[PDB]
Amino acid sequence: LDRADILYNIRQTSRPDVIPTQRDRPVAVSVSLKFINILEVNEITNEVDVVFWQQTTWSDRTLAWNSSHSPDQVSVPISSLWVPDLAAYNAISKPEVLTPQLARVVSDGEVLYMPSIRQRFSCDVSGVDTESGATCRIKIGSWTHHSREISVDPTDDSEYFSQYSRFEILDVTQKKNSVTYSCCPEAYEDVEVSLNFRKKGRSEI
Amino acid sequence: LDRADILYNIRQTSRPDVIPTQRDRPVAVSVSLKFINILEVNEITNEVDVVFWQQTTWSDRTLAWNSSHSPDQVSVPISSLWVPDLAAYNAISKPEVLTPQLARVVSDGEVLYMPSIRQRFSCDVSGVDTESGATCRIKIGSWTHHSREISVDPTDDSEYFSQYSRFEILDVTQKKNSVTYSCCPEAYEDVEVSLNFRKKG
Amino acid sequence: LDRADILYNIRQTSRPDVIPTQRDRPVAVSVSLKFINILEVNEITNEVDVVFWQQTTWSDRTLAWNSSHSPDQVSVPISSLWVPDLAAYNAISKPEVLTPQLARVVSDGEVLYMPSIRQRFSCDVSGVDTESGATCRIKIGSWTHHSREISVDPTTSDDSEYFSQYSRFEILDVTQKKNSVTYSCCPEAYEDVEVSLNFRKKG
Amino acid sequence: LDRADILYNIRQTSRPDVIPTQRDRPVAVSVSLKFINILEVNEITNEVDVVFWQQTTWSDRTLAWNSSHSPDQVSVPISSLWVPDLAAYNAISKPEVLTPQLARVVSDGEVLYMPSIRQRFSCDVSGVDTESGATCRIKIGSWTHHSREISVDPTDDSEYFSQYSRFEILDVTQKKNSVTYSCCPEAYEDVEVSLNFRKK
Amino acid sequence: LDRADILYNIRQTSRPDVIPTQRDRPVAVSVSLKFINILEVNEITNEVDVVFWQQTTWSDRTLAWNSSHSPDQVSVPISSLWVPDLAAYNAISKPEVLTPQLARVVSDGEVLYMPSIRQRFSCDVSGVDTESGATCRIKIGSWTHHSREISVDPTSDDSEYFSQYSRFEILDVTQKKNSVTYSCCPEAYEDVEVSLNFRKKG
Numbered sequence A: 001l002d003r004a005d006i007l008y009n010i011r012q013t014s015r016p017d018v019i020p021t022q023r024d025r026p027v028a029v030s031v032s033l034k035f036i037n038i039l040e041v042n043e044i045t046n047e048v049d050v051v052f053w054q055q056t057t058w059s060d061r062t063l064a065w066n067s068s069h070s071p072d073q074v075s076v077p078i079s080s081l082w083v084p085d086l087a088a089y090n091a092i093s094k095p096e097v098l099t100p101q102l103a104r105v106v107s108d109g110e111v112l113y114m115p116s117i118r119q120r121f122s123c124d125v126s127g128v129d130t131e132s133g134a135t136c137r138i139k140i141g142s143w144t145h146h147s148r149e150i151s152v153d154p155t156d157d158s159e160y161f162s163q164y165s166r167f168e169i170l171d172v173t174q175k176k177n178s179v180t181y182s183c184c185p186e187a188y189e190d191v192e193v194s195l196n197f198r199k200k201g202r203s204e205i
Numbered sequence B: 001l002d003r004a005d006i007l008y009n010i011r012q013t014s015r016p017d018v019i020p021t022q023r024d025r026p027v028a029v030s031v032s033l034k035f036i037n038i039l040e041v042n043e044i045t046n047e048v049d050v051v052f053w054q055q056t057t058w059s060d061r062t063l064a065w066n067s068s069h070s071p072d073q074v075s076v077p078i079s080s081l082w083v084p085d086l087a088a089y090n091a092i093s094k095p096e097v098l099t100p101q102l103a104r105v106v107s108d109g110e111v112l113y114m115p116s117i118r119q120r121f122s123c124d125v126s127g128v129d130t131e132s133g134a135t136c137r138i139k140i141g142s143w144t145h146h147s148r149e150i151s152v153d154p155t156d157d158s159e160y161f162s163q164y165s166r167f168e169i170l171d172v173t174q175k176k177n178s179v180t181y182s183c184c185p186e187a188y189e190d191v192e193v194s195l196n197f198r199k200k201g
Numbered sequence C: 001l002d003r004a005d006i007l008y009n010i011r012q013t014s015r016p017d018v019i020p021t022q023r024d025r026p027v028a029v030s031v032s033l034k035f036i037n038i039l040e041v042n043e044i045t046n047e048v049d050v051v052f053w054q055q056t057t058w059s060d061r062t063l064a065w066n067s068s069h070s071p072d073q074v075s076v077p078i079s080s081l082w083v084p085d086l087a088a089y090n091a092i093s094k095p096e097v098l099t100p101q102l103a104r105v106v107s108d109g110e111v112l113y114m115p116s117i118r119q120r121f122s123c124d125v126s127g128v129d130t131e132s133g134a135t136c137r138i139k140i141g142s143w144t145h146h147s148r149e150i151s152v153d154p155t156t157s158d159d160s161e162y163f164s165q166y167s168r169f170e171i172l173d174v175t176q177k178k179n180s181v182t183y184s185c186c187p188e189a190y191e192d193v194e195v196s197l198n199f200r201k202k203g
Numbered sequence D: 001l002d003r004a005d006i007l008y009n010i011r012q013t014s015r016p017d018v019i020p021t022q023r024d025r026p027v028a029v030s031v032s033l034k035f036i037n038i039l040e041v042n043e044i045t046n047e048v049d050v051v052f053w054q055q056t057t058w059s060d061r062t063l064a065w066n067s068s069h070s071p072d073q074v075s076v077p078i079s080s081l082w083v084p085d086l087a088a089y090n091a092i093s094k095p096e097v098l099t100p101q102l103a104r105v106v107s108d109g110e111v112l113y114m115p116s117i118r119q120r121f122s123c124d125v126s127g128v129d130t131e132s133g134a135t136c137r138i139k140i141g142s143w144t145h146h147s148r149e150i151s152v153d154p155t156d157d158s159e160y161f162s163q164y165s166r167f168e169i170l171d172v173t174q175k176k177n178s179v180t181y182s183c184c185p186e187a188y189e190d191v192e193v194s195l196n197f198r199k200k
Numbered sequence E: 001l002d003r004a005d006i007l008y009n010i011r012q013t014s015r016p017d018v019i020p021t022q023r024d025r026p027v028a029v030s031v032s033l034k035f036i037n038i039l040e041v042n043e044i045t046n047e048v049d050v051v052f053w054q055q056t057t058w059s060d061r062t063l064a065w066n067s068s069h070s071p072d073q074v075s076v077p078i079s080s081l082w083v084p085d086l087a088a089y090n091a092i093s094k095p096e097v098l099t100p101q102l103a104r105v106v107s108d109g110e111v112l113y114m115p116s117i118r119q120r121f122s123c124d125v126s127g128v129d130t131e132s133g134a135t136c137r138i139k140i141g142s143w144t145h146h147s148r149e150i151s152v153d154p155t156s157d158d159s160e161y162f163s164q165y166s167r168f169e170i171l172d173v174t175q176k177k178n179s180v181t182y183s184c185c186p187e188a189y190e191d192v193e194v195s196l197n198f199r200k201k202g
């Protein structure tokens, strides 16, 4: 197969509305945020404006092809794929996608989607101007798929962080959690990302 | 049936433009706001910028399937479903939907749609910096379907509200009302949501 | 007929690009603004930010059905209908439509479309802080259809009936009058409704 | 023919990606800006926010019909027409179109497209608070078509300016410019609009 | 062939989702920024708002036609073409495209795409108010195609198209080839690093 044949097959049999569950087991979605910049912090309102790469991986076996004498991977527009309906539960702006909306599909059906996102959050900005810094927690999970349909798992903290930010990263921790909504008995899995950061140049003058 | 068959059937037959009235009774729509954040308040202009989850449920029997050896629920893009034409009558900004535009459909045709919305309102902000706080009333009902076509029913306070807001919720009440427009004799049902909130000390 | 049949017929025979003229008479479009809020006023720049319901009615006989044992009215997405190409000639922002983009269609082909719009205008804000107030004129007409294709008419109810009690401003008077403009370029006249909003800052 | 038949024919045989050149002559595009408002001026940054009607006309003979017992003109959505790929070379914001995106098509194939646009420009704002005023020059041309494919020609310009603006128009001049760049052998046309305005 | 036939052929067959690799060589993409304006600079936050022409060229032989008694070039909407998935790795805003989204296609399959973009960047603004000025580095490369699929190469006066009305002036522009690696994957991504040396006029 060549790239043209693989992309044709995906475009033609793309069920983007259909979650690719295998034998009624959940789709395992891995999520890791790589922080690139912290642009605005407001200690009065407890709001932060951040740029991050949202590394997202899952399997969709309906995409798979025989890689013998074929590409091992192709770039696919996400409009041609099912993508997990992830939301940041404490976002106060829509995610602004800064990058081309293409995912990488591996011949075994693994999908890697990593948009660069600018987004504003409600989180704890207290201590940003101190040595120990602020800890802003961001919670990401499926909006509509509970734990029997989607599982969410986490996958240098400053490796891609801008050296030119007014802020610096002290630590990033990413832990699995579970939330319940009042309407409904099912739990939703989430990743809770704790961004420990502080303002550069905190000497009193 | 599997998910692929159910979603195919819904996409092919759901009639998103067709209100799913049964035997000329109104469609019963339930609406409840869960307040998540209060972002900006202006006591001079009487404007508030709020984030809320708009829990919306109704029945559409045209979506129903036999759940024997089948999923009991599916996630469906709202572009493939009829959705009630709800509007906040005192909104001064378009609703900004922060979440994926998917609804949950149950095999009996019950639909659950709960977008996270950021929206600005004209309401009473007087007393926000006092112990008793401000009471901002938000009115939500059908833009085009009167009470013979859509009924709106409300059916805890602070449960999902951000601990990091500058504001705190003292009380939320959600009560059924009716409005009439000058053009037309028919009443439109609404839910009136009273948000009692104050600036934290 | 049921709602499903009527909406199917409209969706299938919808010519949304085709003005529904009858026997080469103009389409009579009625426009009435119901002011809901005055949000920002700048007396230096002569700019106002207003929210209004734009009550818009016209006839499209291609939509009509026999109402015997049928609904008298249905809700239709405006993407399935011809709608008049109305513009506010002194708007300085795009109209922000706050409401679901549905119209009501009556079995005789009458259409009622009433979006809630937030929009900014260039108009006379002088006198806003006085007892007699400011008079801001908003002109709304067809962008491309002259008077032989579209006529715009005010309708024949309290000016403040839907106006927010929480606005910093109050309405003293609203008048809505028919106006015609003829440009040097072109022989044809373009109709508008001129809406005069007399308002002031509350004491 | 009636309006329904003409609009059907246009929608069905619309090649909106195909420039309507006749016998390898350029498409003659006329552009005139009618200034409506000057909203924000910054003399420090040399930026202005303006509202104008962009009167745009050209011929597309593929649209033409016999006007005997037929309308002389119809309103057509611009998504059903070829439109010139005009850009304002000194714009610093996307054009905000304030009006319905319809053009008028005449039975001889003339197209009249006149959007109301709000747009921000980088131009000379120096002297805005003086008697002689500022002169802000706006250059509009085809982004991808050289002079053998599109010619741009100027066609009152101040007549419909808002009496309520903080600013007033002293003069508008609109001239043709033809530019050959070092990169490329072909000439590109533009219209250069000089807006002489001042604070009242 | 006339323009209508060429544009019909491209619209029917161009495969915009398909990278036009020849015999498993990478697609050679040339990228050069022409700076038009510097609109806002913040020395505290190290942010700049810039307008530039992103001159972008590559070959797609699936677009080619016989130019005998035919146009040598046509204008094509980029929705009908494969375009490289270029991103500015240090952008902090979406690219605002100010121009019609059309490319020029030459009869040999060369594509020339040059959008005018307004975009905000995180870069070194230190020294902007000094004689030596600031040097702001912008890195542009493929978001999803590594060096075996896309190669990036740089291709007049640095101020030739720069606005005389900017508060800033350009001292120098240099454009060099580099490579980046991401943690997920062993493969390198080629980029152009554009160094904009500029200062405040006043």
Ligand SMILES: FC(F)(F)c1ccc(OC2CCNCC2)cc1
Pocket: B089, B139, B142, B143, B144, B179, B180, B181, B188, C114, C162
């Ligand atoms: F002011 C008010 F709340 F009492 C009110 C709200 C809405 C309203 O009419 C709407 C009914 C749905 N379609 C048209 C507008 C009348 C009064």
Ligand SMILES: FC(F)(F)c1ccc(OC2CCNCC2)cc1
Pocket: C142, C143, C144, C145, C183, C184, C185, C186, C190, D034, D055, D114, D156, D157, D159, D160
């Ligand atoms: F300025 C002018 F005289 F050149 C001019 C102005 C307007 C015009 O047509 C208007 C009437 C139809 N709706 C908006 C444009 C033609 C010429």
Ligand SMILES: FC(F)(F)c1ccc(OC2CCNCC2)cc1
Pocket: D142, D143, D144, D181, D183, D184, D188, E034, E055, E114
């Ligand atoms: F600089 C350049 F070589 F990249 C370049 C410059 C100008 C140019 O054409 C102009 C006229 C047509 N619209 C774009 C600018 C093309 C390339």
Ligand SMILES: FC(F)(F)c1ccc(OC2CCNCC2)cc1
Pocket: A114, A160, E089, E139, E142, E143, E144, E180, E181, E182, E189
């Ligand atoms: F920071 C940096 F410049 F060193 C850098 C930039 C980009 C990068 O990886 C991207 C390559 C294409 N896929 C998305 C990530 C790694 C480092």
Ligand SMILES: *[C@@H]1O[C@H](CO)[C@@H](O)[C@H](O)[C@H]1NC(C)=O
Pocket: A066, A067, A068
């Ligand atoms: C993949 O292709 C190879 C080589 O042609 C062959 O061994 C095999 O049939 C294929 N594998 C599967 C699982 O279909």
Ligand SMILES: *[C@@H]1O[C@H](CO)[C@@H](O)[C@H](O)[C@H]1NC(C)=O
Pocket: B066, B067, B068
């Ligand atoms: C539903 O499923 C069961 C199991 O096959 C079937 O026997 C029954 O008739 C069905 N009933 C309805 C009403 O769908």
Ligand SMILES: *[C@@H]1O[C@H](CO)[C@@H](O)[C@H](O)[C@H]1NC(C)=O
Pocket: E066, E067, E068
């Ligand atoms: C292109 O067409 C011309 C004229 O019809 C013909 O002479 C020639 O063989 C063609 N050229 C190529 C390289 O195919």
